[PDB]
């Protein structure tokens, strides 16, 4: 029964998920002056040419675009990572207004939204096993600002009317997630957690420096989704972001000078 309301939002999560107060929680504020350039970091390898999207789901907290992860079809490697991470799903976090919505912040700047491309380490065989390991997941985070439309997002925007309420899904085949990337793959990286319950400390975060631009109309359509199920009272799906958590004993490293 966790969510993003006054009564069940992030400040309540610790009562059912005590790791909420742990040593490697996400998101964090990225202090760009304190992040150290690490010349040992490799370019990110994003290999999405053979990606197979299957379905889009409103899970009551966001919408997930799901992929076939039964083979190495859409993988992340290089950057800070050892080995091969398979894309399982992407989703977004967004605000009620354009001045909030991202989970990570940059020098305390909040973006309108944040895209999470979620990948699991093939050495653990399945996502459920991977989330039990400190190097189980790699999440590629991309900021969204409001300006020009993102053409590669529109297929997502246009299906949202069909999954308005919690538990609705729709076929979502042949979607190319390459259309959601910015030009540069310059990134920050740090060790962290899932940003929703169960808040497991299993993520290598890779946050791109360059945002993507989406239109006001695209993000307005995100904000028409519902947290509620069909024939429950309407609660708009907005402000589904966790605030920045303490950095504690962590270093954020930059891939770029």
């Amino acid at each position: 029964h966790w969510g993003y309301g006054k009564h069940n939002g992030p400040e309540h999560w610790h009562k059912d998920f005590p790791i909420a107060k742990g040593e490697r929680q996400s998101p964090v504020d990225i202090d760009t002056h304190t992040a150290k350039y690490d010349p040992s970091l490799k370019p990110l390898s994003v290999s999405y040419d053979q990606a197979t999207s299957l379905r889009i789901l409103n899970n009551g907290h966001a919408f997930n675009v799901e992929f076939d992860d039964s083979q190495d079809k859409a993988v992340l490697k290089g950057g800070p990572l050892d080995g091969t991470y398979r894309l399982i799903q992407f989703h977004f976090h967004w605000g009620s207004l354009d001045g909030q919505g991202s989970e990570h912040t940059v020098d305390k700047k909040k973006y309108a939204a944040e895209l999470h491309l979620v990948h699991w380490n093939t050495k653990y065989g399945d996502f459920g096993k991977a989330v039990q390991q400190p190097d189980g997941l790699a999440v590629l985070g991309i900021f969204l600002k409001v300006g020009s439309a993102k053409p590669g997002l529109q297929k997502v925007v246009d299906v949202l009317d069909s999954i308005k309420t919690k538990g609705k899904s729709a076929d979502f085949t042949n979607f190319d997630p390459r259309g959601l990337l910015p030009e540069s793959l310059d990134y920050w990286t740090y060790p962290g957690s899932l940003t929703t319950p169960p808040l497991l400390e299993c993520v290598t975060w890779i946050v791109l420096k360059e945002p993507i631009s989406v239109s006001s109309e695209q993000v307005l359509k995100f904000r028409k989704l519902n947290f509620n199920g069909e024939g429950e009272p309407e609660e708009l799906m907005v402000d589904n972001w966790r605030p920045a958590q303490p950095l504690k004993n962590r270093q954020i490293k930059a891939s770029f000078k």
Binding site: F127, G128, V131, L194, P197, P198, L200
Partner: peptide, 4 residues
């Protein structure tokens, strides 16, 4: 994460 949970099953799912």
């Amino acid at each position: 994460x949970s099953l799912p």
